[PDB]
Amino acid sequence: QPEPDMITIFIGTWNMGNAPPPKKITSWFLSKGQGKTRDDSADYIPHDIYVIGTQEDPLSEKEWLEILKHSLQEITSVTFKTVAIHTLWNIRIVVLAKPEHENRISHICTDNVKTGIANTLGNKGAVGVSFMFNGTSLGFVNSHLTSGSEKKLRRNQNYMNILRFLALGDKKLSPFNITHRFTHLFWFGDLNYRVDLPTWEAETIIQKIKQQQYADLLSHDQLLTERREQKVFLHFEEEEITFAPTYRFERLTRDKYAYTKQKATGMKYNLPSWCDRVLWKSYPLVHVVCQSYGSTSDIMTSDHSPVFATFEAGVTSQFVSKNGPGTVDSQGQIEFLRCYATLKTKSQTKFYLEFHSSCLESFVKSQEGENEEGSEGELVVKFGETLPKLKPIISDPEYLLDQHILISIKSSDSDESYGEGCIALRLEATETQLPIYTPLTHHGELTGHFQGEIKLQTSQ
Numbered sequence: 001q002p003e004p005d006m007i008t009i010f011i012g013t014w015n016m017g018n019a020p021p022p023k024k025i026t027s028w029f030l031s032k033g034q035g036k037t038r039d040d041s042a043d044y045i046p047h048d049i050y051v052i053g054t055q056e057d058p059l060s061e062k063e064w065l066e067i068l069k070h071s072l073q074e075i076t077s078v079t080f081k082t083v084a085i086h087t088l089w090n091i092r093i094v095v096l097a098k099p100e101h102e103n104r105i106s107h108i109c110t111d112n113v114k115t116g117i118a119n120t121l122g123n124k125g126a127v128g129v130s131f132m133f134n135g136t137s138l139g140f141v142n143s144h145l146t147s148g149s150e151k152k153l154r155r156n157q158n159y160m161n162i163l164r165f166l167a168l169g170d171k172k173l174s175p176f177n178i179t180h181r182f183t184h185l186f187w188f189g190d191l192n193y194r195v196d197l198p199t200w201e202a203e204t205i206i207q208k209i210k211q212q213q214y215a216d217l218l219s220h221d222q223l224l225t226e227r228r229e230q231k232v233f234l235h236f237e238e239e240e241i242t243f244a245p246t247y248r249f250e251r252l253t254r255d256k257y258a259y260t261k262q263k264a265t266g267m268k269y270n271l272p273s274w275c276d277r278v279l280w281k282s283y284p285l286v287h288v289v290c291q292s293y294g295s296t297s298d299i300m301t302s303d304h305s306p307v308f309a310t311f312e313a314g315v316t317s318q319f320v321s322k323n324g325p326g327t328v329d330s331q332g333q334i335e336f337l338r339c340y341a342t343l344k345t346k347s348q349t350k351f352y353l354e355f356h357s358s359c360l361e362s363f364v365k366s367q368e369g370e371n372e373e374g375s376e377g378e379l380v381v382k383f384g385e386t387l388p389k390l391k392p393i394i395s396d397p398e399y400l401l402d403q404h405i406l407i408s409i410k411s412s413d414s415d416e417s418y419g420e421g422c423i424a425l426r427l428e429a430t431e432t433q434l435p436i437y438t439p440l441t442h443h444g445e446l447t448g449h450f451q452g453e454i455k456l457q458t459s460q
Ligand SMILES: Cc1occc1C(=O)Nc1ccncc1
Pocket: 435
């Protein structure tokens, strides 16, 4: 039975509003309702992996697992296996997988981050899960960020805290945060960004939603505008939104947006907003295609509607040769030519590189680079032809061209990373000098760039 080279992944996010769900929630897992929805001809076809993020979840783990498994079994006639479940307060992540994948899944990690301080610590934060699926690392983050239309900068800070402190994936990747540890990272939740229009415009916004005219609302969505200004979610993707705002509804209908200030809201307005979102970030040149992104219309126990997203995602096999794993394959090599980093830092330490990849037996430290001053006031760190030749464990091009090299540039004085990025080995040619590039980030913010050439030798 052959190993897959693609799987489909369901992502759900639902802020349940502290209320039990209704008896039927199958529309959620079928990607049925508003937006980019799934074709009826696929309804009986199970996804490989289901990842369910809830916020304001009132159920026990057992209660919610029973509902989720019985829902999937009704849709698909498959009894899904529980990969992981993790809860922080009322923020929960469940990962379920088809039973045939049980032996393909390993290295399961869970963690949470509590955001805020004193007043603002005790209900917001994130949960996450990571695992290996054959040769492919997968990470999943469900975050409930700070609420309130005038707290976008707090949400941005919450995002930075979560990606700094959430401890998932391979701990040996010590310079790298979760935005670089996975082949595919999915980040979803009640992110709580609002449509930034005046309170006086509430009824105008409602009119627009009834006309399915979202363009002048999306142009004021704080998550889209903060992402365009590189304030948050740098280098993540999101599918185009084609569904109505998912918050704030009167319960037990979807006919009314409950936006007016009330004692129960702290006398805050809740203008219709796309609070509930799914974003992703995959390594360069890995297949990932969003096949649905929408909200359900029939599930009305909460003041939010559930959101679904589905994805095709490229996966690779657990490769064995006569040589690697457990030795190098001297028919393989990775050479970096004429490489330089450009850094936004004022520091004048010397810098060295670390190269990390599961195609190497262990990470590789470079020599220090040569600092020069860039014309427009920046640091240029030149490596020339000094970089160590990397010796992959396997030389077969079917394996090596699917791999990635993570790069950290570190201070010789502190050994702290000033920037992290990723280079694909999915080259146009082998035995050929070819341009490479990655932006460099630290704590998820842009700190510079790495560019040069690569020359890859495979067994072919
Ligand atoms: C198309 C191409 O091939 C090799 C390099 C490039 C390239 O785009 N370089 C670049 C883009 C933007 N800013 C600075 C540099």
